[PDB]
């Protein structure tokens, strides 16, 4: 039975929810006519519709996430989730733009090197972590003023092994000083190794969950992996509220 | 993760239909494919007929054939707990060896989020979104007696497409025109994935890679499948020490 009750989530797992993001009918429309026109560019709700209820809900979520990051003395924020299809791309990109709009210098990173498609909203991480590219080539300017971006890059055959290396942590330390926040869209926590990976990013970590998509045991499994790996799991983000 | 195959059959009453060694030649061929700016994956069963892994797969091929005719079903499904287990490698090599045994085989890449099987040679996504007819989606490969449906272009709604009425209707017809329909299904990450695999209505096998899975991760995958009503015949233990 898919979980839709946010109160049930907070009490069952001691997971404070940093935001309730409604299912945007305007986002569904934008998605529909981009998939109809054969668009290779996903729209950014935050840039196109500043008054949308999901966007106002995202503005709230952003301030709360900033405070959490500052309390934890971090410069990296990590979004994860139990599975794909939960709105982790939508959230990470809209959050990055709102942080950039607030006045912050933001670095967005697509760390899902098996299915990351954050480039669609605008070499990448796979090359940088393979030493096929230097940092100054991987870091790209975005249409959005103040937002810089590192795509997932060419799909590698060893994405897990690349994220387990010394290089990612060491790049993140420098990038955390050159940018106000480093926002990472990480791969979903399917297994122990996924949790270890997210631990190495060492940022304020938020578990994305979509309404009606997860069973109680499914949420429990993701939380237990993150928590047993020693990840800084600040709280959750509940997405697609009807 | 778990290395001992005896612990797997004992702990989950999951009889292993095959033990497939880590093939050193496959490792070499992947390295060689990687370094060369190549857009194709080498089929081991084609290139190395007496590779120990290919030899273990002919044993597996026969066991699955007995399974599917006892079940009076010409749909075979492979699933797994996560990516990186060798499900692509096993399905394509099992498809080729079944063709070599003199069967008309249809291989379907149902994993529409990654869709890699076409690298070994319109697809499923265009078929289930009514953009293509079955006639245009089914392709004849360079392997004689082997036909193939690719993943197709990555859709925004993969689970929605696999949960549509079209999938089982198409499989009903294709099962009458081929001796074997072999499906590379998405991994069983949640009950929704187990339902989709249940609608495929085939003799189903759980792929597990040596040293990758905890006892809990294996248990979750099996539980999702058994509770969704899936005909889980047994498992395939891949990457064992040669
Ligand atoms: N709150 C929402 N309102 C409307 N559409 C949404 C919402 N959240 C996600 N979506 C849509 O659902 C789909 C899946 O979201 P996405 O971020 O791509 O998933 P993933 O978690 O795999 O990154 C996309 O088409 C996205 O635009
Ligand atoms: N038994 C094996 N011996 C050697 N290499 C293997 C074996 N099984 C899989 N591989 C390799 O491991 C990688 C991952 O396997 P693949 O089938 O692509 O994973 P997935 O489960 O995500 O489909 C590939 O490069 C594949 O060729």
Author numbering:
A (entry chain B): 476 to 597, 603 to 722
B (entry chain A): 477 to 597, 603 to 723
What do the authors report?
The crystal structure of B. cepacia BceF kinase domain, overexpressed and purified from E. coli, was determined at 1.85Å resolution. The plasmid construct used encompassed the BceF kinase domain, i.e., residues 471–741. The structure features a fold similar to other BY-kinases of known structures, showing a central, eight-stranded curved β-sheet, flanked by 12 helices of varying lengths. In the crystallographic asymmetric unit, there are two virtually identical kinase domains of BceF, with a root-mean-square deviation (RMSD) of 0.36 Å across 241 paired residues. The structure revealed an adenosine diphosphate (ADP) molecule bound at the active site, probably co-purified from the bacteria, since it was not added during the purification or crystallization of BceF. The catalytic pocket exhibits the ATP-binding motifs common to BY-kinases and other nucleotide-binding proteins, including Walker A (residues 556GPTPGIGKS564), Walker A’ (residues 585DAD587), and Walker B (residues 661VVLID665). The active site pocket in BceF, with side chains closer than 4 Å to the ADP molecule, includes the highly conserved Pro497, Ser499, Gln502, Ile561, Lys563, Ser564, Phe565, Arg590, and Asn719 residues, along with the moderate evolutionary conserved Gln498, Pro559, Arg690, and the evolutionary variable Asp506 and Arg517 residues. Of note, Arg590 is facing the active site only in one of the BceF molecules in the asymmetric unit (chain A), but not in the other. In contrast, the interface of the dimer observed in the crystal packing of the BceF kinase domain was not evolutionary conserved. If the BceF kinase domain dimer observed in solution has the same arrangement observed in the crystal form, the partial obstruction of the active sites by the interface might explain the low enzymatic efficiency observed.
BceF is a bacterial tyrosine kinase (BY-kinase) from Burkholderia cepacia, a Gram-negative bacterium accountable for respiratory infections in immunocompromised and cystic fibrosis patients. BceF is involved in the production of exopolysaccharides secreted to the biofilm matrix and promotes resistant and aggressive infections. Similar to other BY-kinases in Gram-negative bacteria, BceF is composed of a short cytoplasmic N-terminus, followed by a transmembrane helix, a periplasmic/extracellular domain, a second transmembrane helix, and a cytoplasmic C-terminal catalytic domain. The catalytic cytoplasmic domain contains the Walker A, Walker A’ and Walker B motifs that are also found in ATPases of the MinD/Mrp superfamily.
